[PDB]
Structures are given as structure tokens and as C-alpha cells.
Symmetry: C4
Subunit: 182 residues, 4 copies
Amino acid sequence: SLNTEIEMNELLEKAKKIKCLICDVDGVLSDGLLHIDNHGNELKSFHVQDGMGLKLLMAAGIQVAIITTAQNAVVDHRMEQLGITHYYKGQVDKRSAYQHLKKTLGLNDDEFAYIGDDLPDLPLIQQVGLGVAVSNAVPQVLEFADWRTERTGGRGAVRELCDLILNAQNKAELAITGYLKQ
Amino acid sequence: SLNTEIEMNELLEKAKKIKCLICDVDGVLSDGLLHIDNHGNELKSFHVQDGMGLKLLMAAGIQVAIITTAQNAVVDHRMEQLGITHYYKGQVDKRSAYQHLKKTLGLNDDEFAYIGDDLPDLPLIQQVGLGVAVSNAVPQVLEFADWRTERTGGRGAVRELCDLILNAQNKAELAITGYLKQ
Amino acid sequence: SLNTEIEMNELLEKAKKIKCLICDVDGVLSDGLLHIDNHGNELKSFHVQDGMGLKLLMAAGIQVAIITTAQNAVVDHRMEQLGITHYYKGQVDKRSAYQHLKKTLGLNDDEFAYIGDDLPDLPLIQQVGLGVAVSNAVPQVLEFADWRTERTGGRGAVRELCDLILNAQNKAELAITGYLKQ
Amino acid sequence: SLNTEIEMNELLEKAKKIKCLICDVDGVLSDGLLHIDNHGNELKSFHVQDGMGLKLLMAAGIQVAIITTAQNAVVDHRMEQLGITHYYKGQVDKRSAYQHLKKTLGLNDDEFAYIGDDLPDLPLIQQVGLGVAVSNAVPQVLEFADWRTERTGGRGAVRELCDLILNAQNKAELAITGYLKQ
Ligand SMILES: [Ca+2]
Ligand SMILES: [Ca+2]
Ligand SMILES: [Ca+2]
Ligand SMILES: [Ca+2]
Ligand SMILES: [Ca+2]
Ligand SMILES: [Ca+2]
Ligand SMILES: [Ca+2]
Ligand SMILES: [Ca+2]
């Protein structure tokens, strides 16, 4: 209809500006599960299509960052795997890490996207240019985000956002070409 | 309709009284799976939104307790992570642990909520003020509970109950504010 | 309708005779997944409601057995957890293990139930009194079984069969009572 | 309708020619998840029905190969379990491995099937006789494949392709017979 075209255009205009995507970890890059053993070892589960999404953004000159409440070494191992250097762990209130990232990169609020699932993500989701909820996000986060993914956290929701941004900016071909050559 | 309004109000009136939520572990705080390796190590998988749910109740002055048949050290590690001190392990029949918790806290039956999935939860679900079934509960538990969650165990069902209670008591803002300041 | 009543009765008459349930492991007591690490350690994931199902059958005097192609020690650890002594590992063709179990127990073919998901289960599913497919079974197994569960393997499908058998035989109350007293 | 019959026949004619199935690993033989622990150990999860699918192809004289970007030892352990000798790891661009496999086997492009989920699979999916997308594949891969499975990667999608090929070639009975005799 007329309304879905308008809304689709307004979303595309937000995504056209994006120079950095920020992700939360648990519930967004993961399914939300914390796997714990009898000895207290911990694991999380990440999805390969999301890891490819982040690598495609970076191949296209779009920066990637993480801001998480998680503190464990699983996060460090995953960030190292993906070559993500801008990341912040143990952040219970996330506003201060966002402001630090903003200073580091020199970007306007509207040049960030942020994808979240729970209440501590809410102020970042409302502040940035493109605030995104995974489909399994808590009710307030689904309510107040600019957009929500079809897929759930850890199942390709972050890839869906990566592809939206690349497509909006006509960088999808650049990204895969650049990725495949490294 | 008239009937859904009445029922919604009756549920809210139960939730308004709640001073302690009691959870079962396997099938409720987890998906129900027991992951076992070749050496007999075991793991369970918990969900971060449920862990946040429990922390929000506690930030709002609502106590949390666990009563489980599980005996393994996974449970202890998770309870320590969440700062939950009232918990009972290896309880095959759960009535005696409930009565002990009741004595410890000094609460009326109707000031407890209990969220369960299987037959040993049934007498507790029927006795407390707000007896809750996860959506994947066995048929009798779904039948006799006061309410059932939309979500399944380990996927945010306990968070859905936490949010119902906080919302009923107008403590949702208090809870997130209090959480974010620690 | 008339037809669903007939079929429901014919299924109940099969279940009334059952003196032993036989389960396959991978895909039936599990989701089907084999979790493998970098060092070749392996895990499988079992569901607590299915473990309770098997314990309820045994509390009601119904025997339980496993016949599996799996050979790894995960299976032994799980059987020990559940107190299941009649079980057969590494059986690629399963007919010979079934005949051995039949000799051991002294039962007629029609006093066995068998729940399976893949082609090597087919001859057992067709031979026993109550041959059952998990809902995620391969197409031929769904086709030729007497009945299929609503739930998938490792998610409570075996419990659904346990409850059908107990209900048919009016042993559900006996079973939970007997379980809760040990 | 007339159109679904034509398309079903055209798909069957592709599958009749197949002398080798090539699979990707992560997202195709797995759910896509990478499970990572605090020490950097990694696991993936494979599905037993897919492992049986591959063994049935091989019992019927159809070769199996893997081409993956994954480099970790999980892959080697799984290939050894399944007796798959033709496989290629760490391939970021996959075209060169395909050409090497083609030389090794002496087959025409149209005698290969390939099942994929992400952009680096696309040129192989378009080149081979039967290019297949798992149902959870990224949008371009779903778009350009000859066929897509109903099931998702790691949940029996590869088995669904194995069964299509065996059925098209009237080798399903040969395959199970041959499997069950080893
Ligand atoms: Ca989160
Ligand atoms: Ca906004
Ligand atoms: Ca339970
Ligand atoms: Ca009640
Ligand atoms: Ca099986
Ligand atoms: Ca039969
Ligand atoms: Ca892949
Ligand atoms: Ca093609």
C-alpha cells in the first residue's frame, strides 16, 4: 500500500546513513542461552550467517562494534574470530560505552545502528539512527525500536540487518567481492 | 470480551499479592534438555532474559526461590550467578521444601507464585496464589495451573511471569531503575 | 466423527496390552543432534519429561528397553541415570536385539511398543503391537507406524507415548504415586 | 496442476544424473551454530538422519564430498565418523576446490549436486546439475538454487536431498539393503 512504501523508504533512509553497526551479544548474536557445565565452564552459541554479515559490513568499510553485559572469555574468543576490535564487556548500563565509542569513531548519533533484545539496550536503540529489535526481544524493546528483524537472535537476525544496510547503500556486491578476495 | 476482561483482572489480582516467585529448574528455567558427554559431564542451558526477570524481581523487593529435583552442580553455579540464596535441590516430592520455604519467609500461600512443567510441581501449583505452567508443560500441569505462559521453558517463559508480576504491582520502572544502579 | 472414535479405540486397545516399551536413542530420546568438539568428545541432549515418562512406566510395572545403533558412552551414562538395564548398543540391523529381548522377557510381539525415527527401526515398528513414529521421523517410518506423536524426538515425544500407555491401562495415578514414593 | 508436474519432472531429471553430492558444513550439515567455550574449545551439532542420508548414498554407489570454509578439527572428526574421504576445508572461495574435485572424479558439471546456505556457495549451486538451498539459506541462495529443502540445515535437509536422489534413480531399496549389510 501507500503506507508500507513510505515506511519502507523511511527505513531505507535510516540505513543509508549507517557507518557503524553495534550489536549486543547474549540474545542477539546468540539465542540467549547460557550453557553451563558441572564445573562452571560456560558456552554460548553464535550463528555463521551473522558472522558472515559482520564480515561483509567490514569488507564494505562499515565498522562493527559490540556492547555487552557479558564478561566471560567466550565473548573475547568470538570477537577475535571475527576480527572485531571495538567492543565493551561487563556494561550493565550501556550509555557510557556508547558515548566512548562515539568519541572514538567521530560519528553522529544517526550514523550508528544498534541491535538489541532487553531493557538495557533501550536507551541506545532510541538514541541511534537505526535502533533494531531482534524478533525475540522483550516487549518494550519490540515496541520502541525503529525496526524489528523477522529472525530471532542467534539465528540470522543480525545478518538480516547487515543485508538491509548493505542493500540500502548499494554495497552488497562490493562487500561479497571484497570478502571473497581475502 | 466481558469474559477476557474478568479473567485478566482475576489474574492481575493474584499477581498483585506476590511476594515470592518459586521456579522449578529443568523444563522451566531450562528447555528441558540434559546435555551429557562421553565422560558423564552434564550441562543445562538457561536463558538470559529469564535471568534478567529474576534480577528485576529481586531489585523490586520480590524474593526468588528455586525447588528442583535436579541435584547436579550446574544448578549451584547458576544460582550463584543469579544471587539466588533460597533454593532446594534433589526434591522428588516438593511439598516439604515448599513448607520449609514458607516457614523461612513467613508468607501466606497466596503470596507465593510457582512456575512448573511436570507432575511433581502440581500440588505446589494448586496450593500457591499464582500457579503457573510453562507452555511446554505436561497436559495435567497445563490443565490445573492458574495461568500458562506463551513462551516455552528456557526461552523467556519465566521472564514473561516476572513482567506480569512487576506490571501488576506497578513496580516495573522501580525494578529496572534499581537493577541499572548496581 | 465415527472414524476418529474407531481409530482412537483401536489405538487404545493396542496400548492396553503393552508390557514393555522399547526406544531408539538418537532422534527419539534425543533431538537427533550429535554434538562434537575439537578433540572428538561427543554429547547428546535428552529431555527430562521423557526421562520422567520412562520412570513412570517402570513405577507402574511396565518394563523399558533401548535398542540403538549408537555405541558411545553417552548412552551408558544416560541408561544408568534412568535405571534402565535392558539395552542394546551398536545394533545396525535391530531385529536380532529385539529377538533377544523378546526371549529375555517372555513376551508376545503384541505386548511390545517400539518408538523409532529411521529406516532400521521399520521392521520393529511393523512387528510389535504398538509401533510408533516420532513426528520428525523419516517419511517411510511416519507412513508405516501404527501412530505418530505430536512432539519431536528429544522434546517429549517419548513422554507422550508413556502417558498414552499409562492412560489406556488406567495406571497413570499408580505410576505417579509409586514414583513419588521413592 | 500441469505446472507442478512439469517442475517435479524437471527436478527428477536433474536428480537422475547425480553421481556425487557435495555438501557445505556450517548451516547445511549443521544448524549454523558455533558453540564456543571459555577456553576457546568449539563444537558443532550434526544430525543423525543426515549422516544416514550420506551413508545411504554411498551404499548405493553415489559419492559424497564436502567443501567448507570451516577449518577446525570438529569437521575432520565428523568426516572420519561418516567415512567421507573427499573433503576440503578452509575454502573461502569454493570454486577452486570444486574444480579439483571434478578433476579427481572425472564427472560432468551436471553429474554433481551441491547443497549450500550462503553466498560463497552460490557459484557452485549455479554451476552443478542440481544446486540446492537449505530452507534457512540466505535470500540470494534461496532465489538462485534449482530446489530448496523443506527442512533447515542440521535438521534433516541433507537427508531430504539424499532421499530425492535415491528415489529418482530407483536406488532407495538398494541403498538401505546395502547399508544394513555392513
Ligand atoms: Ca541481551
Ligand atoms: Ca529511533
Ligand atoms: Ca521440571
Ligand atoms: Ca490455583
Ligand atoms: Ca534413530
Ligand atoms: Ca503395526
Ligand atoms: Ca555455510
Ligand atoms: Ca542450476
